[PDB]
Coordinates of N, CA and C in Angstrom, one line a residue:
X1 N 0.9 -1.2 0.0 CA 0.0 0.0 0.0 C 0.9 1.3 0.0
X2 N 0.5 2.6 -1.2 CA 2.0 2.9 -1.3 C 1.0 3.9 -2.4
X3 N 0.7 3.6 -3.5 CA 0.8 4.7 -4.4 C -0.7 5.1 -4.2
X4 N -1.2 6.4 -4.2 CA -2.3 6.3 -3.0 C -2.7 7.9 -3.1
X5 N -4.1 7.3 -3.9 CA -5.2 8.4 -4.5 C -6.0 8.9 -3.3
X6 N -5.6 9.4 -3.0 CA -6.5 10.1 -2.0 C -7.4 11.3 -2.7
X7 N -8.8 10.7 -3.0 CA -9.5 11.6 -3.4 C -10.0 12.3 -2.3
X8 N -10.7 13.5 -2.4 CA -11.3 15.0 -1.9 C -12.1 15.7 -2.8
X9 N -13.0 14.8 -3.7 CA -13.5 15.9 -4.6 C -15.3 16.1 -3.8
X10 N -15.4 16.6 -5.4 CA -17.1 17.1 -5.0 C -17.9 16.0 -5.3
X11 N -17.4 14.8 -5.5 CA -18.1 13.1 -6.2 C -17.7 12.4 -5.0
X12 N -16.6 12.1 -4.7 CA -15.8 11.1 -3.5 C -14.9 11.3 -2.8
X13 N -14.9 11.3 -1.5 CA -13.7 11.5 -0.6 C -13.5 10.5 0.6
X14 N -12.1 9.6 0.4 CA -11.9 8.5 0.3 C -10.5 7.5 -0.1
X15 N -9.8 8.1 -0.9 CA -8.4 7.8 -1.1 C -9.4 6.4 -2.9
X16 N -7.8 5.4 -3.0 CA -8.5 3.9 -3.9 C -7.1 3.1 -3.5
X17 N -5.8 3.9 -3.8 CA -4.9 2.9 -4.2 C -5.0 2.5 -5.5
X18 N -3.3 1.9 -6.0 CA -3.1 1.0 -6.6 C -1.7 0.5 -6.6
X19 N -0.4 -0.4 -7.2 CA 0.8 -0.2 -7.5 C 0.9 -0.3 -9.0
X20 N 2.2 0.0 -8.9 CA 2.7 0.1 -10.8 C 4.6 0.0 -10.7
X21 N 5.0 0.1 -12.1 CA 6.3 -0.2 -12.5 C 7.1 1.3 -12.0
X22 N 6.6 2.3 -11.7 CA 7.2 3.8 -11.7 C 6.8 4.8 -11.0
X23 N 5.1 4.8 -10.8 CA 4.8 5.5 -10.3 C 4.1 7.0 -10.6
X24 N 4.1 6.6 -12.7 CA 3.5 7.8 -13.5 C 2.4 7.1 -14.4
X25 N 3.1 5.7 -14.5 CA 1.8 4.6 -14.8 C 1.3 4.2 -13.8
X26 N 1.3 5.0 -12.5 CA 0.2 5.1 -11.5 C -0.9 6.4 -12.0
X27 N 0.2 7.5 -12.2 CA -0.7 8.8 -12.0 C -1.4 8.9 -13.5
X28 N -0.6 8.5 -14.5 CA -1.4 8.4 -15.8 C -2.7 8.0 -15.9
X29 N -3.1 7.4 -14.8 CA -4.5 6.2 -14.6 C -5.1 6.8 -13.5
X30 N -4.6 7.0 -12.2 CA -5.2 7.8 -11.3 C -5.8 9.0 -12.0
X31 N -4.8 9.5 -12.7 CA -5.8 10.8 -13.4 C -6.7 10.8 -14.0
X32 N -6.9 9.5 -14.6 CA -8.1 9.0 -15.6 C -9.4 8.5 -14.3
X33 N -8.7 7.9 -13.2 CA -9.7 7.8 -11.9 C -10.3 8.8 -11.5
X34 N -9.6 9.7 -11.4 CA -10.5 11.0 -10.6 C -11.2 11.9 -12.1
X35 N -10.6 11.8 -13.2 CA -11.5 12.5 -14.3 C -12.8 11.7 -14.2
X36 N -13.0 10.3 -14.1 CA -13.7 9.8 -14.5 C -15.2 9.5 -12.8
X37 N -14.2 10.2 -11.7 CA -15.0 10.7 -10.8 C -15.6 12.4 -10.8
X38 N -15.1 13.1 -11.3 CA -14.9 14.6 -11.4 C -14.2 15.5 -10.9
X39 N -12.8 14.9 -10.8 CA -11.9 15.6 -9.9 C -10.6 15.8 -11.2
X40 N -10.4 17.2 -10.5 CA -8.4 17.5 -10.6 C -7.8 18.5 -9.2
X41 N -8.5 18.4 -8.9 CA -8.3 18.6 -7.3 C -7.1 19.7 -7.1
X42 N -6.1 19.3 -6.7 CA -4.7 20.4 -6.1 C -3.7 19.5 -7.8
X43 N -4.1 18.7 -7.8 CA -3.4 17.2 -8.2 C -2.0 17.6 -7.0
X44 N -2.0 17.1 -6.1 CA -0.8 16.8 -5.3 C -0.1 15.7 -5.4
X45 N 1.4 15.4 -4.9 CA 1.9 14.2 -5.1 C 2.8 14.0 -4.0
X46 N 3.1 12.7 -3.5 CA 4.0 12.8 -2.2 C 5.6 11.7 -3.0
X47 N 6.4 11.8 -2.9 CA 7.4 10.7 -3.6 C 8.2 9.7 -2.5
X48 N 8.4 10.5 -1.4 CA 8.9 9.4 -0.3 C 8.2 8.5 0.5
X49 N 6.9 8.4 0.1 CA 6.0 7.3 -0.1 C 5.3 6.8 -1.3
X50 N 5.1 8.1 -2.7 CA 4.6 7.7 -3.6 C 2.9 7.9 -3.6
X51 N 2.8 8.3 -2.5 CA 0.8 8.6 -2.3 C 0.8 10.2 -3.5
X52 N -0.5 9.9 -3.8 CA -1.4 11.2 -4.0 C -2.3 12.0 -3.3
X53 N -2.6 12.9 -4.2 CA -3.9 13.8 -3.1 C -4.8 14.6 -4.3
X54 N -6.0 14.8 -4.6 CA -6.9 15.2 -5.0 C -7.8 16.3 -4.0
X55 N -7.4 17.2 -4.0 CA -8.3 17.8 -3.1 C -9.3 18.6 -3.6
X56 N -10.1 18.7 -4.4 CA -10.8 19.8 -5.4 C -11.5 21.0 -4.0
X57 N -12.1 20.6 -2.9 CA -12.5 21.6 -1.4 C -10.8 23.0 -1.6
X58 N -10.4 22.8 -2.2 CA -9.1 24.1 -2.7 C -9.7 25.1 -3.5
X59 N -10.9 24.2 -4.3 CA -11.5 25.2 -5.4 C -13.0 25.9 -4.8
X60 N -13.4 25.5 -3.1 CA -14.7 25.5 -2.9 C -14.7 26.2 -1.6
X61 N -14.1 25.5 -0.6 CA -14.3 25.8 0.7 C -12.8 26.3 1.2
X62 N -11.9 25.8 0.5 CA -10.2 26.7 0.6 C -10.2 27.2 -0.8
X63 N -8.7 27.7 -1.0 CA -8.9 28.1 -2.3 C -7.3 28.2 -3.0
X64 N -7.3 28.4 -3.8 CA -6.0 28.6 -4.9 C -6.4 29.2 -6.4
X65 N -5.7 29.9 -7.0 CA -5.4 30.2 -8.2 C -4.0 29.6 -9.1
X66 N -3.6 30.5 -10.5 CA -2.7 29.8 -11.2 C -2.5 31.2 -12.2
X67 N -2.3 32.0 -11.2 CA -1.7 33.4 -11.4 C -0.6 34.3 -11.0
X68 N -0.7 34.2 -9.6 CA 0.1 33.7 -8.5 C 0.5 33.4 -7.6
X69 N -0.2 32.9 -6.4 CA -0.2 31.7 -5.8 C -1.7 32.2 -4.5
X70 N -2.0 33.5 -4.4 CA -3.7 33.4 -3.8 C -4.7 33.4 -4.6
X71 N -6.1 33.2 -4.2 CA -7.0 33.0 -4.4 C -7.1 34.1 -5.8
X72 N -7.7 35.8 -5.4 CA -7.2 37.0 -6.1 C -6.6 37.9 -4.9
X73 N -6.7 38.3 -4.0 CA -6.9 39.0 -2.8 C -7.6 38.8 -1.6
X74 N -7.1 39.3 -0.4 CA -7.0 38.7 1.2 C -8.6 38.6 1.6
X75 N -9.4 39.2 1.2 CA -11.0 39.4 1.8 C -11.6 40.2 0.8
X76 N -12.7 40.6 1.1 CA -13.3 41.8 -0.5 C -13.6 42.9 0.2
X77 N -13.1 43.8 -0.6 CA -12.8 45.3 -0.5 C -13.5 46.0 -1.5
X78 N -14.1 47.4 -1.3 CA -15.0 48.1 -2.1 C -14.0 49.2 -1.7
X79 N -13.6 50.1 -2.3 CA -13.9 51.8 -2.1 C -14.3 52.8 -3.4
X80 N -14.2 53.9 -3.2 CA -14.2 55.1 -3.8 C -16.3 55.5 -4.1
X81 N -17.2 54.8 -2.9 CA -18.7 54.6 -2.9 C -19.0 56.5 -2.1
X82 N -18.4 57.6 -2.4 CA -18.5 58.6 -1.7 C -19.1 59.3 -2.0
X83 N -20.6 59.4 -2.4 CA -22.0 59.8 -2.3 C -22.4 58.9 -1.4
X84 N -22.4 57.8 -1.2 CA -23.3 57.2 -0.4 C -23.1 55.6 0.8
X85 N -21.9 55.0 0.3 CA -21.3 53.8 0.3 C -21.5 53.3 2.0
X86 N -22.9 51.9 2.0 CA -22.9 51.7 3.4 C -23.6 50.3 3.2
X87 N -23.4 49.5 4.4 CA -23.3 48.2 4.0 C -24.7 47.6 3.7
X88 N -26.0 48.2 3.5 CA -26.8 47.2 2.8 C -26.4 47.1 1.7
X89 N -26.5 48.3 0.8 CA -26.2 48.1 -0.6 C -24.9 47.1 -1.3
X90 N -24.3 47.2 -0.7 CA -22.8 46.5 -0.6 C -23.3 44.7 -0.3
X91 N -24.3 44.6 0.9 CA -24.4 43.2 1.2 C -25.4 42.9 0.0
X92 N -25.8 43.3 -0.7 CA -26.7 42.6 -1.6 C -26.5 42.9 -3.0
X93 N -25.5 44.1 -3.6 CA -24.8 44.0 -4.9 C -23.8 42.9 -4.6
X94 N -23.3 42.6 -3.7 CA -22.4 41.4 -3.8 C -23.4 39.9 -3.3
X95 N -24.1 39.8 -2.8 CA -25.7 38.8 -2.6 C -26.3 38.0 -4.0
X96 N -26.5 38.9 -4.3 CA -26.4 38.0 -5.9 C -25.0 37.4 -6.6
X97 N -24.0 37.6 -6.3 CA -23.2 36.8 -6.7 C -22.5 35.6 -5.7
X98 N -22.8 35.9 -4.3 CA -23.0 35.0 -3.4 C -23.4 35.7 -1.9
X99 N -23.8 34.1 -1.0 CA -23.4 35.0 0.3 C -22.4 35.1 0.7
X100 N -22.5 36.5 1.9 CA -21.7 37.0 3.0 C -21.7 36.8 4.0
X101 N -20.5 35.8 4.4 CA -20.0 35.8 5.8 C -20.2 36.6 6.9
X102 N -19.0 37.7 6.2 CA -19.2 39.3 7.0 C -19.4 40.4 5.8
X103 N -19.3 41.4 6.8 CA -18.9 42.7 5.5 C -19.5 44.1 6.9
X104 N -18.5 45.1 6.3 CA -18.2 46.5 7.1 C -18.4 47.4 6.5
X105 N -18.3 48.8 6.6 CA -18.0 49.7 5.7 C -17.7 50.7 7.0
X106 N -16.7 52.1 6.5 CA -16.0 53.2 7.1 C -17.2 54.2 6.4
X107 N -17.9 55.3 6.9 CA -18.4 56.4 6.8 C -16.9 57.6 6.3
X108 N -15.7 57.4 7.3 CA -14.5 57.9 7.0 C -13.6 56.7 7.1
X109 N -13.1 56.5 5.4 CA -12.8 57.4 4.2 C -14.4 57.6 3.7
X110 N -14.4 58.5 2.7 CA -15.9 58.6 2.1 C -17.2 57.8 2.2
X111 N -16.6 56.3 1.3 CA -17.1 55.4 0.6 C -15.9 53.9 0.6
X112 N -15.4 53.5 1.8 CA -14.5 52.1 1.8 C -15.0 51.2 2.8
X113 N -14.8 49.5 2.3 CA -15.8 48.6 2.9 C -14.6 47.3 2.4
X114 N -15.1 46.6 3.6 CA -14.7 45.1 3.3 C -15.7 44.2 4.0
X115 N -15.7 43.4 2.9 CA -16.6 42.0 2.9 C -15.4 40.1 2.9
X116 N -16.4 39.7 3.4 CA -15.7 38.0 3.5 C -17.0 37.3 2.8
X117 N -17.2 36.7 1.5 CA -17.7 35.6 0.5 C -16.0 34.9 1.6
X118 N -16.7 33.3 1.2 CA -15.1 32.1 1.0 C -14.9 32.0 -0.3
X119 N -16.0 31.9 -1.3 CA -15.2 31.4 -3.1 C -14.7 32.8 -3.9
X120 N -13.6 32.0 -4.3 CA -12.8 33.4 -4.7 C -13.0 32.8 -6.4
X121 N -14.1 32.7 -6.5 CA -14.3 32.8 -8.3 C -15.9 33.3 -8.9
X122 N -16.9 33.7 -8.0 CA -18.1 34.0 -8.0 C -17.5 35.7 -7.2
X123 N -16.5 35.7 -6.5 CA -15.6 37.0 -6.2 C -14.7 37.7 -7.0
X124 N -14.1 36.7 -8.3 CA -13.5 36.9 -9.1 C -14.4 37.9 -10.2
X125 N -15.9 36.7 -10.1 CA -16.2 37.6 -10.8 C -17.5 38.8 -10.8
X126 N -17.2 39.4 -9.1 CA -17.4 40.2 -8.9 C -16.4 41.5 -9.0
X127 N -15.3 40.9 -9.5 CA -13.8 42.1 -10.0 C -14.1 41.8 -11.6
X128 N -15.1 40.8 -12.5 CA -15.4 41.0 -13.5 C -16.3 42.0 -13.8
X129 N -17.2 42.1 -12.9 CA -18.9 42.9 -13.3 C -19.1 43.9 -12.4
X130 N -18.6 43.9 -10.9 CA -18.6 44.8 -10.1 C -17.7 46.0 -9.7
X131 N -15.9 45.9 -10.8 CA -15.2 46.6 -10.2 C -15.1 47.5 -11.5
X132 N -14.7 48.5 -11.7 CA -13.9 49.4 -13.0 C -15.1 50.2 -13.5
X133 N -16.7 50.4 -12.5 CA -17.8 50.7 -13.3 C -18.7 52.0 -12.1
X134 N -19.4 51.9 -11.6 CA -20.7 52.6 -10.8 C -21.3 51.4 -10.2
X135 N -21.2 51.6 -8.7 CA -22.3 50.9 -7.5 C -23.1 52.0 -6.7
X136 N -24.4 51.7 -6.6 CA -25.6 52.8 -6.6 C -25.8 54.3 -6.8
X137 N -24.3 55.2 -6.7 CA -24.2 56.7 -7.4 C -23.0 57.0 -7.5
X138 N -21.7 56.2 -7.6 CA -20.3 56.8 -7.3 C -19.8 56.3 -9.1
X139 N -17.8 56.3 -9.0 CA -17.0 56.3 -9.6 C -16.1 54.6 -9.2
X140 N -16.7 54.2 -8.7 CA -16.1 52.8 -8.0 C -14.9 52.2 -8.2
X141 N -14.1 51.5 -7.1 CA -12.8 50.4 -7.4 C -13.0 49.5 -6.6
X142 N -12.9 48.4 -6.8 CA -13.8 47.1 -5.9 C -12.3 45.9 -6.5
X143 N -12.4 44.9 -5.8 CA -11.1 43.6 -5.3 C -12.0 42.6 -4.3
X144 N -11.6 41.0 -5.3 CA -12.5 40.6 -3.9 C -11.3 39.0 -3.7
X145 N -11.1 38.5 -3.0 CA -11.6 37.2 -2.6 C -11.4 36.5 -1.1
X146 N -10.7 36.3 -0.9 CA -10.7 35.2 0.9 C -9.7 35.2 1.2
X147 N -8.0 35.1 0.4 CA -7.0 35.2 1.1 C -5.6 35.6 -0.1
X148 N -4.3 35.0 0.0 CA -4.0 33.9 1.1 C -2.7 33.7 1.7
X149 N -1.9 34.5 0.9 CA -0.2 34.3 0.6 C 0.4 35.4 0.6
X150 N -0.5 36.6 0.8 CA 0.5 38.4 0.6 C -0.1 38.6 1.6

């Protein structure tokens, strides 16, 4: 027991096993195991035992990108809301793109606020639709996601 799929996806979480000649004609196959469960998880690999790891909960309830190396940014941040910028409007222009954990806003500065969503890709793409434009009467600059590494 040795070369060692440890699945974590959104289908099974659970590990399977198998052995092989190398240990890439493990992962060549494992990979075809977890595609063929719904996973690509972290694709992790350990070598001084030869286990794997599949964690796809990286992409849901933790998180990572392939940009470089956090989610997008530490929590979600609004400013420049200075006509009016206060946290209903803020908890429910970001509400439809998911829920909120938390979320704040300063009266001083003008119009600055931070919120906590966990998925940093429904946050991503609230830096697609909600940032570089107008939130209920301002000039806006908005950033969103959970963490992880700056």
């Amino acid at each position: 027991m040795q070369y060692k799929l440890i699945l974590n996806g959104k289908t099974l979480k659970g590990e399977t096993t198998t052995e092989a000649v190398d240990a890439a004609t493990a992962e060549k196959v494992f990979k075809q195991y977890a595609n063929d469960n719904g996973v690509d998880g972290e694709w992790t690999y350990d070598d001084a035992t030869k286990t794997f790891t599949v964690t796809e909960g990286s992409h849901h309830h933790h998180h990572h990108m392939h940009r470089d190396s956090c989610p997008l940014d530490c929590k979600v941040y609004v400013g420049n809301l200075g006509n009016n910028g206060n946290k209903t409007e803020l908890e429910r222009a970001f509400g439809y793109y998911g829920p909120l954990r938390s979320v704040w806003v300063a009266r001083n500065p003008p119009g600055f606020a931070f919120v906590e969503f966990e998925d940093p890709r429904d946050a991503a793409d609230a830096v697609r639709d909600l940032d570089g434009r107008t939130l209920c009467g301002c000039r806006v600059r908005v950033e969103l996601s959970n963490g992880e590494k700056r």
